[PDB]
């Protein structure tokens, strides 16, 4: 039951952080209307690094938690 | 003294570190409840090579969230005045 429980687990997360990562998009590139400058443009890359690590994050959870679910009985 | 820009400066950088807590708080449950089983022996083999595999990607990745998050945040700082 563990094995339902973790995969229920990894795919509510990946929900979460798909969620979450698109709204902190929108957010940060609200912010370059007004905010220019070398540190504007640390930050833009700061949060394409962070993106790019939340979208990574994503499709491992995603991952483990379809294999969990479809071949539960190699769990 | 303090304009409304950098104050949104702050808040969407306050976001994107409580959603960096967010994730580490709950990889860490799940890789602490996963592992359990790999110590076990429940999870052996291609099981195991499963988990291991999404758990290499999502801590090398966790590690790039991080990264990127501090870079975000010396950006902040540096528009704040704290060089």
């Known amino acids: 039951d563990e094995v339902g429980a973790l995969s229920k687990f990894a795919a ?16 940060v590139q609200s912010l370059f209307g007004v905010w220019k400058g070398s540190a504007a443009d640390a930050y833009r890359s700061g949060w394409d690094e962070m ?5 990574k994050v994503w499709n491992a959870l995603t991952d483990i938690a379809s294999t969990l679910g479809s071949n539960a009985a190699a769990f | ?3 409304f820009d950098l104050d949104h400066i702050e808040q969407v950088t306050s976001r994107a570190r409580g959603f960096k807590e967010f994730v580490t708080e709950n990889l860490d449950q799940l890789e602490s409840r996963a592992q359990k089983l790999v110590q076990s022996g429940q999870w052996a083999g291609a099981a195991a ?3 291991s595999q ?7 990745a966790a590690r790039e969230l991080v990264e990127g998050l501090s870079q975000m945040e010396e950006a902040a700082r540096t528009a704040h005045g704290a060089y």
């Open chain 2, 1 to 3: 003294e303090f304009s």
């Open chain 1, 51 to 55: 993106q790019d690590g939340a979208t």
């Open chain 2, 54 to 60: 999404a758990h290499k990607e999502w801590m090398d």
């Open chain 2, 49 to 51: 090579a499963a988990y």
């Open chain 1, 12 to 27: 509510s997360l990946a929900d979460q952080m798909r969620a979450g990562s698109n709204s902190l998009d929108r957010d």
